[model samples]
Target: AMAREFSLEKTRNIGIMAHIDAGKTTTTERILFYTGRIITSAATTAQWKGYRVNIIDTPGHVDFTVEVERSLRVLDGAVAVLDAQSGVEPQTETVWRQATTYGVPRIVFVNKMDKIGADFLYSVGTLRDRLQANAHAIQLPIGAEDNFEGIIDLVENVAYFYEDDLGTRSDAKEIPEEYKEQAEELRNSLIEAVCELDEELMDKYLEGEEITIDELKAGIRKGTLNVEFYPVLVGSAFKNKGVQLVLDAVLDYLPAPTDVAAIKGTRPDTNEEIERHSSDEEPFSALAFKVMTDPYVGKLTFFRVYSGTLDSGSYVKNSTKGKRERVGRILQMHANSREEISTVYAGDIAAAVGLKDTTTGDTLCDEKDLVILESM
Candidate 1:
């Protein structure tokens, strides 16, 4: 069954975080519509190319800062969308600061390149000068403003053009004559920026030894997760310019929950140190990060399974609430729709309905476990 194919190593829980109107919702929507599904997670979770990714589309406003903060709490990584016209906004800074508190690794997307004032390179510079981020472009805008076209992938060192339908159709070929020199220069810079992450890589490049794409990607992932490097990509989501690549980047770079350090928790009674890894075999541990109302159908409680798989209709203890909750039903959502599922895998995000008492930031699992993870 597809359920068994869903493993911790292949699951990625991420937050599409950005300033309001930065296309966070659009990007999330695009991802939800185009991608496949696991049919057992958030209203926005999906299964793409056999890998399941749960997207926590966090809010950007301060009045709802808790929404973004808590979503980030349960996520393994994030994608930061920036507006090319204005570099970094105060709202952008706001989200960045919160993402940092959780040490979330990120890949930045420079959106709105089709706008009149769009400046791809300038926006990247803001990441460096203002955020003190070691940002490097992995792709360059092929064209900009009214004449916007596509992008040059610095890693592959190729130019890509979108054929149709919001960038779902992509073609990677030669670096067009006009963008060749620019592509060559960007490719070299990307190589240099990535090499600094690994001494051996830097030495090999200096010796003119052939370095593989996998090697460069390894270094970039390290830099990204280490919070030392930020990979910059560009696109116009509205024009369907380059939305597909962003999802590809999430799969390529973001960490699986298993890749993260052991999750820390405290004993319900003693508040002593406790820990849980992202494994299904371990005692079931999940974080209730989202709880919505409208008790009519089933105001669901969405959670990320940090450890152990949960079966449909198998009762589980809400450790945070210190109460028992029947697994009345498990709902899987992709955008606005829903479906029923028989199981939820470890490290995957899923929603459960019919909980008597459980709210955001609570831990749901075995009552006998007596564990309460630190809240957001």
Candidate 2:
């Protein structure tokens, strides 16, 4: 097992977002497969029959806007999957606005490319014009519809080909001849978009110098996390094509806990501003972002630790609610499933049961500190 360390740099707290049937669930399935969270062949063969993404999947309909709103409030970032065929639909705009209102940076996935009406260019344009998003394409689809078999990763300047029904992939020998021209065009456009994030990079590009991949990745990550740029990707979740590239993009471009600004709160006793850095050494501070009524476990409270470490059986004060609660057991949540653990580190989101007073958005921290972190 991976060591339970409280390092903000290693954790990503993101949600999958989209209108209904835009393939958010399918895209999530692919991400889990590539990340070694799930077995590819078994997952595909079983059609993810019993699988679930650990994060909440919001309902796309207007009636369920409350559900979407609550989920976006706690999520640090999101992958907004759009239907390639329809571009920006009514519900797409709704969710986009919700994310915007909550200041959630997002990556866009133009999904269902294997479908007949899926137009990559049209979708990209809609994201920019209709959604009013600062969009940049990170990967361009190699082909459309049935011939859509691969993607050209703009950041890495490499092509990946999907080879099997189970979504196995391999590196392309070279950029496909058919896609070389468009790929170059998208690459230049992407570089230009990324350069706008940093004045230094823009000056270097203006001087006709090449920016290193590392530099571009860093700039893009900063831009995306700050909601300055919405990196776009093309993939077919139904066909399981270009999914791994999206996961790689998540690990590469999204903000970990370290990327966020220091957590701001007010000390309950002193009434002074309390800022907690994302470090285990800081005073303990965590926010309960989600609450689920599990049949087996009873009430499960999911929280993201912004600072310090929380060990099982420890006790902490609920700053927001003004009560003390015991940390009975820490568990990693995979949707409805739970795997109990002994501790949770900074930057990680985990669940605990048997807290009588802790509620969503409540901050758990040292009693002496007495700070209440803000909730989205």
lDDT of each: 0.78, 0.74
Clashing pairs in 2: none
Model 1 TM-score on a 0 to 1 scale: 0.93
Q: Which ten residues in a row have the lowest lDDT in candidate 1?
A: 36-45
Per-residue error for 326 in candidate 2, Å, reads 1.2
Q: Per-residue lDDT of 1-376 in model 1, one digit per residue for the tens?
A: 2365567778778887676577666666667766753322344667777788787756557543666666776898889999898888776777787777778899999988888889999999999988878889999887788777778878877778765453345667888898888887888889999888989999999999977988888888888887778899999876777777887788888888877777888887684898887777788888887777634555888887787778887778877667888877777776656667788877877778888788888888775576777553
Tens-place lDDT per residue, model 2, 217-299, is 98898898888899899888888887766766777777766776777888775657878888888888887866777677787
- CA lDDT of 145 in candidate 1? 88
Which candidate has the highest lDDT of all? 1
State in Å the error of residue 283, model 1: 0.3
Clashing pairs in 1: 166-240
Summing lDDT over every window of 10 consecutive residues in candidate 2, give the lowest-scoring window.
Answer: 39-48
TM-score for all predictions? Answer: 0.93, 0.87
* Candidate 1 Cα deviation (angstroms), residue 3: 4.0
